[PDB]
Tab-separated table of C-alpha atoms and ligand atoms in Angstrom:
chain	number	residue	atom	x	y	z
Z	22	UNK	CA	106.770	143.133	120.696
Z	23	UNK	CA	103.406	144.706	121.584
Z	24	UNK	CA	100.535	142.690	123.079
Z	25	UNK	CA	96.856	143.613	123.171
Z	26	UNK	CA	93.946	142.063	125.012
Z	27	UNK	CA	90.248	142.420	124.269
Z	28	UNK	CA	87.316	141.196	126.301
Z	29	UNK	CA	84.090	139.561	125.251
Z	30	UNK	CA	81.517	139.791	128.018
Z	31	UNK	CA	78.206	138.157	127.178
Z	32	UNK	CA	74.950	138.314	129.129
Z	33	UNK	CA	71.433	137.504	127.925
Z	34	UNK	CA	72.934	136.908	124.479
Z	35	UNK	CA	74.345	140.420	124.202
Z	36	UNK	CA	77.941	141.591	124.028
Z	37	UNK	CA	79.427	144.483	125.969
Z	38	UNK	CA	80.653	147.278	123.689
Z	39	UNK	CA	82.325	150.562	124.647
Z	40	UNK	CA	82.870	153.725	122.681
Z	41	UNK	CA	86.429	154.012	121.469
Z	42	UNK	CA	88.101	157.251	122.604
Z	43	UNK	CA	90.237	157.240	119.443
Z	44	UNK	CA	89.700	157.261	115.662
Z	45	UNK	CA	86.098	157.459	114.416
Z	46	UNK	CA	85.122	156.592	118.001
Z	47	UNK	CA	82.923	153.640	117.076
Z	48	UNK	CA	81.352	151.167	119.451
Z	49	UNK	CA	83.842	148.318	119.737
Z	50	UNK	CA	85.134	145.579	121.998
Z	51	UNK	CA	86.762	146.648	125.257
Z	52	UNK	CA	90.518	146.175	125.404
Z	53	UNK	CA	93.966	147.714	125.404
Z	54	UNK	CA	97.722	147.242	125.406
Z	55	UNK	CA	99.321	144.996	128.004
Z	56	UNK	CA	101.640	147.126	130.095
Z	57	UNK	CA	105.186	146.366	131.217
Z	58	UNK	CA	105.083	143.970	134.147
Z	59	UNK	CA	101.493	142.889	133.532
Z	60	UNK	CA	100.224	139.391	132.928
Z	61	UNK	CA	97.635	139.243	130.145
Z	62	UNK	CA	95.044	138.805	132.896
Z	63	UNK	CA	96.034	141.881	134.910
Z	64	UNK	CA	95.817	143.961	131.740
Z	65	UNK	CA	92.397	142.549	130.887
Z	66	UNK	CA	91.057	143.317	134.381
Z	67	UNK	CA	92.583	146.798	134.330
Z	68	UNK	CA	91.136	147.591	130.899
Z	69	UNK	CA	87.656	146.471	131.948
Z	70	UNK	CA	87.892	148.716	134.999
Z	71	UNK	CA	89.053	151.780	133.065
Z	72	UNK	CA	86.496	151.379	130.253
Z	73	UNK	CA	83.427	149.853	131.923
Z	74	UNK	CA	84.115	150.063	135.640
Z	75	UNK	CA	83.211	146.382	135.975
Z	76	UNK	CA	85.028	143.657	137.895
Z	77	UNK	CA	85.629	140.545	135.799
Z	78	UNK	CA	87.488	137.240	135.698
Z	79	UNK	CA	88.866	135.320	132.724
Z	80	UNK	CA	86.514	132.541	131.657
Z	81	UNK	CA	88.647	131.264	128.795
Z	82	UNK	CA	91.113	132.345	126.169
Z	83	UNK	CA	89.148	132.573	122.943
Z	84	UNK	CA	91.141	133.337	119.821
Z	85	UNK	CA	94.685	134.669	119.524
Z	86	UNK	CA	95.787	136.660	116.485
Z	87	UNK	CA	99.345	137.521	115.584
Z	88	UNK	CA	100.759	139.796	112.925
Z	89	UNK	CA	104.570	140.048	113.220
Z	90	UNK	CA	104.756	142.285	110.146
Z	91	UNK	CA	103.080	145.042	112.155
Z	92	UNK	CA	105.142	147.761	113.805
Z	93	UNK	CA	106.121	146.638	116.268
Z	94	UNK	CA	105.224	142.932	116.086
Z	95	UNK	CA	101.699	142.542	117.397
Z	96	UNK	CA	100.069	139.753	119.383
Z	97	UNK	CA	96.310	140.064	119.912
Z	98	UNK	CA	94.539	137.955	122.572
Z	99	UNK	CA	90.764	137.805	123.073
Z	100	UNK	CA	89.297	136.576	126.353
Z	101	UNK	CA	85.841	135.277	127.221
Z	102	UNK	CA	84.984	137.225	130.360
Z	103	UNK	CA	82.485	136.827	133.146
Z	104	UNK	CA	81.314	139.535	135.519
Z	105	UNK	CA	81.881	139.091	139.273
Z	119	UNK	CA	86.375	157.901	137.959
Z	120	UNK	CA	84.525	158.951	134.746
Z	121	UNK	CA	81.108	157.774	133.580
Z	122	UNK	CA	81.680	154.995	131.050
Z	123	UNK	CA	80.365	154.687	127.513
Z	124	UNK	CA	78.872	151.186	127.565
Z	125	UNK	CA	76.295	149.299	125.532
Z	126	UNK	CA	75.011	145.718	125.528
Z	127	UNK	CA	74.440	144.812	121.884
Z	128	UNK	CA	72.451	141.701	120.924
Z	129	UNK	CA	74.780	139.223	119.209
Z	130	UNK	CA	72.343	139.170	116.260
Z	131	UNK	CA	72.786	142.878	115.591
Z	132	UNK	CA	76.588	142.743	115.744
Z	133	UNK	CA	76.703	142.954	111.930
Z	134	UNK	CA	75.136	146.436	112.146
Z	135	UNK	CA	78.212	147.499	114.108
Z	136	UNK	CA	80.643	146.459	111.378
Z	137	UNK	CA	81.770	143.180	112.933
Z	138	UNK	CA	84.063	141.031	110.792
Z	139	UNK	CA	82.855	139.141	107.732
Z	140	UNK	CA	84.939	136.260	109.093
Z	141	UNK	CA	83.358	135.936	112.546
Z	142	UNK	CA	80.513	136.678	115.001
Z	143	UNK	CA	79.927	132.940	114.937
Z	144	UNK	CA	83.216	132.728	116.779
Z	145	UNK	CA	81.540	134.316	119.802
Z	146	UNK	CA	78.154	132.735	119.095
Z	147	UNK	CA	79.856	129.398	119.667
Z	148	UNK	CA	81.293	130.612	122.956
Z	149	UNK	CA	83.417	128.025	124.752
Z	150	UNK	CA	83.167	125.761	121.714
Z	151	UNK	CA	85.668	127.992	119.902
Z	152	UNK	CA	88.101	128.374	122.784
Z	153	UNK	CA	91.734	128.287	121.706
Z	154	UNK	CA	91.270	129.514	118.131
Z	155	UNK	CA	94.309	130.946	116.314
Z	156	UNK	CA	95.043	132.627	112.962
Z	157	UNK	CA	98.551	133.839	112.109
Z	158	UNK	CA	98.912	136.387	109.315
O	22	UNK	CA	109.666	139.700	124.909
O	23	UNK	CA	110.590	136.082	124.227
O	24	UNK	CA	107.916	133.783	122.834
O	25	UNK	CA	108.017	129.990	123.005
O	26	UNK	CA	105.789	127.442	121.317
O	27	UNK	CA	105.347	123.805	122.315
O	28	UNK	CA	103.743	121.075	120.275
O	29	UNK	CA	101.479	118.311	121.489
O	30	UNK	CA	100.817	115.758	118.765
O	31	UNK	CA	98.606	112.978	120.079
O	32	UNK	CA	97.810	109.781	118.187
O	33	UNK	CA	96.318	106.621	119.685
O	34	UNK	CA	96.437	108.165	123.156
O	35	UNK	CA	100.199	108.681	122.852
O	36	UNK	CA	102.179	111.902	122.839
O	37	UNK	CA	105.131	112.667	120.582
O	38	UNK	CA	108.311	113.180	122.608
O	39	UNK	CA	111.625	114.316	121.216
O	40	UNK	CA	115.109	113.815	122.625
O	41	UNK	CA	116.938	117.016	123.618
O	42	UNK	CA	120.348	117.577	122.034
O	43	UNK	CA	121.271	119.471	125.206
O	44	UNK	CA	121.498	119.082	128.998
O	45	UNK	CA	120.870	115.530	130.248
O	46	UNK	CA	119.266	114.655	126.912
O	47	UNK	CA	115.937	113.234	128.124
O	48	UNK	CA	112.619	112.954	126.323
O	49	UNK	CA	110.534	116.110	126.220
O	50	UNK	CA	107.931	117.948	124.168
O	51	UNK	CA	108.951	119.480	120.835
O	52	UNK	CA	109.138	123.267	120.750
O	53	UNK	CA	111.364	126.312	120.686
O	54	UNK	CA	111.815	130.056	120.415
O	55	UNK	CA	109.628	131.997	118.001
O	56	UNK	CA	112.168	133.766	115.766
O	57	UNK	CA	111.834	137.425	114.799
O	58	UNK	CA	109.245	137.944	112.082
O	59	UNK	CA	107.648	134.522	112.467
O	60	UNK	CA	104.039	133.925	113.395
O	61	UNK	CA	103.516	131.489	116.270
O	62	UNK	CA	102.384	129.077	113.560
O	63	UNK	CA	105.459	129.414	111.352
O	64	UNK	CA	107.654	128.720	114.387
O	65	UNK	CA	105.620	125.696	115.483
O	66	UNK	CA	105.798	124.177	111.979
O	67	UNK	CA	109.523	124.932	111.731
O	68	UNK	CA	110.446	123.476	115.121
O	69	UNK	CA	108.298	120.470	114.340
O	70	UNK	CA	110.184	119.543	111.184
O	71	UNK	CA	113.641	120.294	112.571
O	72	UNK	CA	113.030	117.986	115.539
O	73	UNK	CA	110.726	115.324	114.037
O	74	UNK	CA	110.758	115.939	110.291
O	75	UNK	CA	106.930	115.766	110.319
O	76	UNK	CA	104.482	118.076	108.541
O	77	UNK	CA	101.830	119.410	110.896
O	78	UNK	CA	98.960	121.841	111.206
O	79	UNK	CA	97.552	123.566	114.275
O	80	UNK	CA	94.284	122.268	115.729
O	81	UNK	CA	93.908	124.601	118.675
O	82	UNK	CA	95.659	126.785	121.216
O	83	UNK	CA	95.811	124.597	124.304
O	84	UNK	CA	97.567	126.641	126.929
O	85	UNK	CA	99.090	130.083	127.291
O	86	UNK	CA	101.483	130.801	130.123
O	87	UNK	CA	102.979	134.227	130.643
O	88	UNK	CA	105.687	135.426	133.009
O	89	UNK	CA	106.008	139.192	132.646
O	90	UNK	CA	108.572	139.314	135.497
O	91	UNK	CA	111.004	137.016	133.658
O	92	UNK	CA	114.080	138.496	131.969
O	93	UNK	CA	113.035	138.932	129.255
O	94	UNK	CA	109.247	138.806	129.635
O	95	UNK	CA	108.036	135.360	128.665
O	96	UNK	CA	105.015	134.111	126.786
O	97	UNK	CA	104.711	130.331	126.360
O	98	UNK	CA	102.118	128.915	123.940
O	99	UNK	CA	101.210	125.207	123.697
O	100	UNK	CA	99.542	123.916	120.516
O	101	UNK	CA	97.524	120.742	119.963
O	102	UNK	CA	98.975	119.557	116.657
O	103	UNK	CA	97.720	117.241	113.927
O	104	UNK	CA	99.755	115.410	111.266
O	105	UNK	CA	99.205	116.259	107.596
O	106	UNK	CA	101.037	115.832	104.273
O	120	UNK	CA	119.051	113.811	109.450
O	121	UNK	CA	117.366	111.064	111.474
O	122	UNK	CA	115.290	112.378	114.360
O	123	UNK	CA	115.029	111.013	117.886
O	124	UNK	CA	111.296	110.444	118.293
O	125	UNK	CA	109.078	108.379	120.540
O	126	UNK	CA	105.312	108.091	120.985
O	127	UNK	CA	104.647	107.738	124.706
O	128	UNK	CA	101.237	106.716	126.098
O	129	UNK	CA	99.701	109.649	127.955
O	130	UNK	CA	99.089	107.584	131.095
O	131	UNK	CA	102.872	107.050	131.289
O	132	UNK	CA	104.125	110.635	131.077
O	133	UNK	CA	104.739	110.689	134.833
O	134	UNK	CA	107.692	108.444	134.089
O	135	UNK	CA	109.226	111.271	132.066
O	136	UNK	CA	108.706	113.945	134.705
O	137	UNK	CA	105.367	115.387	133.689
O	138	UNK	CA	103.172	116.432	136.598
O	139	UNK	CA	99.703	114.967	137.086
O	140	UNK	CA	98.304	118.454	136.509
O	141	UNK	CA	99.879	118.615	133.061
O	142	UNK	CA	98.893	115.063	132.208
O	143	UNK	CA	95.288	115.989	133.003
O	144	UNK	CA	95.511	119.026	130.717
O	145	UNK	CA	96.846	117.025	127.767
O	146	UNK	CA	94.466	114.226	128.666
O	147	UNK	CA	91.407	116.465	128.447
O	148	UNK	CA	92.572	117.530	125.012
O	149	UNK	CA	90.335	119.777	122.921
O	150	UNK	CA	88.080	120.097	125.967
O	151	UNK	CA	90.803	122.059	127.760
O	152	UNK	CA	91.598	124.239	124.755
O	153	UNK	CA	91.956	127.952	125.525
O	154	UNK	CA	93.467	127.504	128.999
O	155	UNK	CA	95.454	130.397	130.430
O	156	UNK	CA	97.567	131.254	133.437
O	157	UNK	CA	99.518	134.326	134.469
O	158	UNK	CA	102.521	133.854	136.754
O	159	UNK	CA	104.220	136.546	138.808
O	160	UNK	CA	106.778	136.229	141.599
O	161	UNK	CA	105.824	136.802	145.247
G	1	LIG	CL1	104.476	150.606	129.743
């Protein structure tokens, strides 16, 4: 089973986005695959470092999404993060404008709520 | 990877405990291994009706504990459950009495905080 973590870092009502180095290379949430021997947290911290060069700490686990029909089975965990050698592609997008970046027709309010939505789950 | 789900169904400040058909028996939380192809949810619902015969729905993810160093790697998810629509060994124990059944004060506080502690996480590695 594969596991992926993504971080949501909010400051002044904006979310941190990075340019994806794969696919259509759109601005998306920072994250990556959890590597063998890594706790979800170590992976999150490593991914933030490699894609934004920032040092962070887990604030809370917000939303977990699992799709076992994937190949291989996939578990997706999203963390609320707080801030504490290539130049990184980074952008702070106002939460309002997130819809202009193609963000899900099912959420955006999920992150608007912040801690209020901690622990959300889906299963599909 | 081995994934385990645990259910915490609270009603009137009491937690649902089940009696283990293994080891020294003893009252513990309902849960089990997530079987291949199941979503965490499908497994939670399945374990819940095999051990308590109740129909439940997930409220929120309460706690995620992962031990990548375990053999095999372990991910343990705890769900706050809510009731919806063979005889099982079931008991509703008041939360302020869980210490009697071996639960630590730390855990009792977690369950006690309820929805307020939703989304808790902890990574555990040896050394
Ligand atoms: Cl690897």
